Amino acid sequence: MGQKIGILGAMREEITPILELFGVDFEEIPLGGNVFHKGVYHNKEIIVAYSKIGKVHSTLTTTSMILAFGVQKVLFSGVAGSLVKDLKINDLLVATQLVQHDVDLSAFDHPLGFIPESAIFIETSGSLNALAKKIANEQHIALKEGVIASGDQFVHSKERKEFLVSEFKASAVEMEGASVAFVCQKFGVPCCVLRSISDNADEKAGMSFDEFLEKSAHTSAKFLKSMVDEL
Amino acid sequence: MGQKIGILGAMREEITPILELFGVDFEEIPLGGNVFHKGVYHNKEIIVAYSKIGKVHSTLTTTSMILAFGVQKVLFSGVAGSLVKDLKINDLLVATQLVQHDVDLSAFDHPLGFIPESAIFIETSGSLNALAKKIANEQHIALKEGVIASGDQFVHSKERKEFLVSEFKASAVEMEGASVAFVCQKFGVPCCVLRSISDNADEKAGMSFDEFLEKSAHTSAKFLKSMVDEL
Ligand SMILES: N[C@@H](CCSC[C@H]1O[C@H](O)[C@H](O)[C@@H]1O)C(=O)O
Ligand SMILES: N[C@@H](CCSC[C@H]1O[C@H](O)[C@H](O)[C@@H]1O)C(=O)O
Ligand SMILES: Nc1ncnc2[nH]cnc12
Ligand SMILES: Nc1ncnc2[nH]cnc12
């Protein structure tokens, strides 16, 4: 058999298209409040789950994928808010680095985003990111490679947008990427975080999110499947 | 053998007194960026670790304790900031409920602290909390039983204090309790979160924290050991 691949989304809506697109039989396995969908695709074992929203949920689920299911790589798919003009609704990006944008130990003179015995930016797999870029070029689609800021707030203001851009030079904002990538780094598991834009993280982001969740989730899922087809 | 007990702190300073007070031989086992100290005490296996600071770190470590080490209960010990007048420096409390105070999905009209498919407040073990209160009464020490607010910021302002009290009726603030308790709930593992006050979460909290970290960490550790002696 090939590698075992963990495939993660945050919301059920982000994994529904994944399960459908792979099209194989899945066994449902409950653990730690999550349901893991276990299947075989192109002689690879795939484990698919949605974590539920936010850093604690996604940390837990990623740790379970690694410790309980023994996945050898983790691919994340879902939606995100755009922080840069060149990322429009439906556009894709892969995260070259991620940060937890809501971490604040400034009382002890630490840079924002920094925790002692850790680092501001978390790295993802250069190999998987390069693969994504090659596939995007072949398919003639744009693919941004940039910084993703993750936090436990849904961002919907110009003020917070300006902070994420100024402080971290982030291209998109979401609520799980940094934590998924962090867990993978700690266990030496290659990680790729893929997102499709659903909104502009501004005052109208809630309504945009609702309008575009289904399409953007599908766009990311279809691209993730394209990557697995090359693995 | 009795139960297997996981014992968790956030910082090395919070577990140093734990290792010393138990006084037994520990085997050091690395996993996921943490070092787990495995020992035998009063015919119980104890697994001691510090997670590192914050929600992602503590979620990961608690999940590892459960999935990799098979702990049957988790006791947390460390320091916290006081939000109520009757909790003074060095005073102890156990968390009856915890909340992630920095969670904000208000863009979708959710109450602060709420995430879909979860709950605002996380419960801890009534049995362990009752045990703590009984021990405190016997030792003639005060022990508050209240709400702990956890987030990824070190709180050091009157404004944020007023929010935690008004929104959640929290008695103390820290950076790991809610996430540790959350993981334990998801896996059906009894949890007790114990904290000793190190500061008042106000403008001077940084300096107070530095002054009292050692003593407050020891106070919590000594009390945690008192509980294990009854288990
Ligand atoms: N409208 C939903 C909340 C979406 S929070 C934004 C999510 O989308 C992206 O995957 C982020 O990382 C979060 O998981 C609800 O009200 O249930
Ligand atoms: N002065 C330290 C940062 C302490 S953050 C407060 C910690 O204490 C309590 O355990 C909280 O939950 C956090 O873990 C440093 O600068 O490394
Ligand atoms: N604006 C936003 N903030 C946080 N997570 C998001 N996911 C999609 N859009 C988001
Ligand atoms: N004021 C504070 N805020 C967050 N975590 C803490 N731990 C101890 N004091 C704290």
Coordinates of C-alpha atoms in Angstrom, one line a residue, chain A residues 55 76 78-81 83 95 98-99 101 148-155 164 172-179 193-195:
Chain A
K55 CA -8.2 25.8 17.5
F76 CA -6.6 20.2 5.1
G78 CA -11.9 24.3 3.7
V79 CA -12.9 28.0 3.3
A80 CA -11.3 31.2 4.4
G81 CA -11.6 35.0 4.5
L83 CA -7.1 39.7 3.3
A95 CA -0.4 28.2 3.3
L98 CA 0.7 29.9 9.5
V99 CA 0.3 32.0 12.7
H101 CA -3.1 35.6 15.3
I148 CA -2.6 32.2 6.8
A149 CA -3.6 33.7 10.1
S150 CA -5.7 31.5 12.3
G151 CA -7.7 32.5 15.4
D152 CA -10.8 31.6 17.5
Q153 CA -12.8 34.6 16.1
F154 CA -14.7 34.9 12.8
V155 CA -13.1 38.1 11.5
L164 CA -3.5 40.8 10.4
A172 CA -6.1 34.9 4.4
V173 CA -7.8 34.3 7.8
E174 CA -9.5 31.2 9.2
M175 CA -9.9 29.3 12.4
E176 CA -8.0 26.0 12.2
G177 CA -5.0 26.0 9.8
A178 CA -2.3 27.1 12.3
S179 CA -3.4 24.5 14.9
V193 CA -3.3 23.6 4.3
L194 CA -5.6 24.4 1.4
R195 CA -8.3 27.1 1.5

